[PDB]
């Protein structure tokens, strides 16, 4: 359960055909159904989707599986750590 606030500055900054895209790419590693996928993912759908993954988020995306075992963000999740690694990258 994450933090639907975070959302709402997600959808600001990212357009519904950006977040359109991300919700594909979301969706391509959710082959499971659940709405959530893999904390090291993040880092993969970034690479692909040519964003620059900020070293920041990666350490706390990394700390996600290594303090629960097994990380997961959900599509929310993933649109604002989109956010915040789009909007670290300078």
Same mark, same amino acid.
């Given at each position: 359960?994450?933090?639907?606030?975070?959302?709402?500055?997600?959808?600001? &900054?990212?357009?519904?055909?950006?977040?359109?895209? &991300?919700?594909?790419? &979301?969706?391509? !590693?959710?082959?499971? #159904? #659940?709405?959530?996928?893999?904390?090291?993912? !993040?880092?993969?759908?970034?690479?692909?989707?040519?964003?620059?993954?900020?070293?920041?988020?990666?350490?706390?995306?990394?700390?996600?599986?290594?303090?629960?075992?097994? #990380?997961?963000?959900? &599509?929310?999740? !993933?649109?604002?750590?989109?956010?915040?690694?789009?909007?670290?990258?300078?």
């Amino acid at each position: 359960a994450s933090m639907s606030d975070e959302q709402a500055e997600a959808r600001a &900054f990212l357009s519904e055909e950006m977040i359109a895209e &991300f919700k594909a790419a &979301f969706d391509m !590693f959710d082959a499971d #159904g #659940g709405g959530e996928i893999s904390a090291k993912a !993040f880092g993969t759908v970034a690479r692909m989707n040519n964003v620059p993954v900020d070293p920041r988020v990666q350490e706390y995306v990394k700390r996600l599986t290594d303090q629960d075992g097994s #990380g997961t963000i959900s &599509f929310e999740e !993933f649109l604002v750590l989109m956010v915040k690694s789009m909007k670290q990258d300078a």
